[PDB]
Chains A and B, each alone.
Chain A
């Protein structure tokens, strides 16, 4: 009785992670002898917050809300990885593969577009020790990598890039170039982000779980052009476990 592509196409439900019945308050137990992989991890954002820059010092600006403008293009899904048991009984998911990045641009008040690479690339996420079962109180905390929003071939609007393109401001042939080093030399940033996944629904029969996540990372820095903004993302998630 699964839905069919043609039932889904054009509805928006393709951007939506699967849901667990509001009755599924079980637990999944962990045989340290057996191994386990996460067959499918689906991360569905619902809220996008950006840290303001408060000009002065002791004020520390707030996380402010934003409007999404890139439409229903935001979900990570089909992610998979090892699920290990450590000495002290924690588990650790290690990402491997999956559609583990989506570009997103949100808009602050006043019109500033903030683009970002929402991602869990290379994610490693562990639990407390002495789990022995995945329950409606298990918490997964971890960190992932945030590569550069644009990759190396990306040519800016004057033809300038890192692995391709011009190295100078060719329309200003005898301008002094020391002014333009920031804009002429492209950089490939690589930063970390942090995620927390909270389990709140568990089907003991099927191995599926679901719940909420919060992650923090940096926005696009336009290959060194400017400075990044800090970004907090909230949403929901779904994952399915198998005895690999």
Chain B
């Protein structure tokens, strides 16, 4: 009943995919064309009900809607974990090198 919510979220999809509601912005460098421009946009307009919701972000150029499709399979969405989004930790989570 005293869970560490961060650990317990490592045992959801959050632990295998980029979680559009929780993961830090630096993860968007693992796949191409996604950083920095789209990543910026994904995060401001978080959170998302389902993965495909990112295609309805207003302003997307068809080139950008293409790159997102090419990578829908690397995304997920789980419930927002406050501990991961508060403090602006999705832009800077204390980890550099």
Contact = CB atoms under 8 A, between A and B. Distances in A.
Contacts, number: 42
A167 B86 contact: no
Contact of B87 (A151, A167, A187, A224): A151
A167 B4 contact: yes
Contacts of A182: 2
A181 B86 CA distance: 24
B82 A163 contact: no
Interface residues of A, number: 17
Q: Is the contact region of chain A dominated by helix, strand, or loop, or is it mixed?
A: loop
B2 A188 contact: no
A235 to B, nearest CB: 25
Given A152-B87, A152-B89, A153-B94, A147 B4 contact: no
Contact of B89 (A151, A185, A190): A151
A162 B86 CA distance: 13
A186 interface: yes
Q: Which size class do B's interface residues fall under?
A: 10 to 19
A148 interface: yes
Contacts of B3: 185
B57 interface: no
A148 B85 CA distance: 12
Contacts of B86: 147-148, 151-152, 188, 190
A185 B4 contact: yes
B21 to A, nearest CB: 16
Contacts of B83: 152, 162-163, 188
Contacts of B87: 147, 151-152
B93 to A, nearest CB: 7
B2 A187 contact: yes
B67 interface: no
Interface in B1-47: 2-7
Contacts of A224: 2
A167 B89 CA distance: 21
Given A162-B5, A187-B2, A188-B82, 4 more contacts: A152-B87, A163-B84, A164-B94, A190-B86
11 contacts: A151-B89, A152-B84, A153-B94, A162-B4, A162-B5, A162-B83, A167-B4, A185-B2, A188-B83, A188-B86, A190-B86
Interface of A: 147-148, 151-153, 162-164, 167, 181-182, 185-188, 190, 224
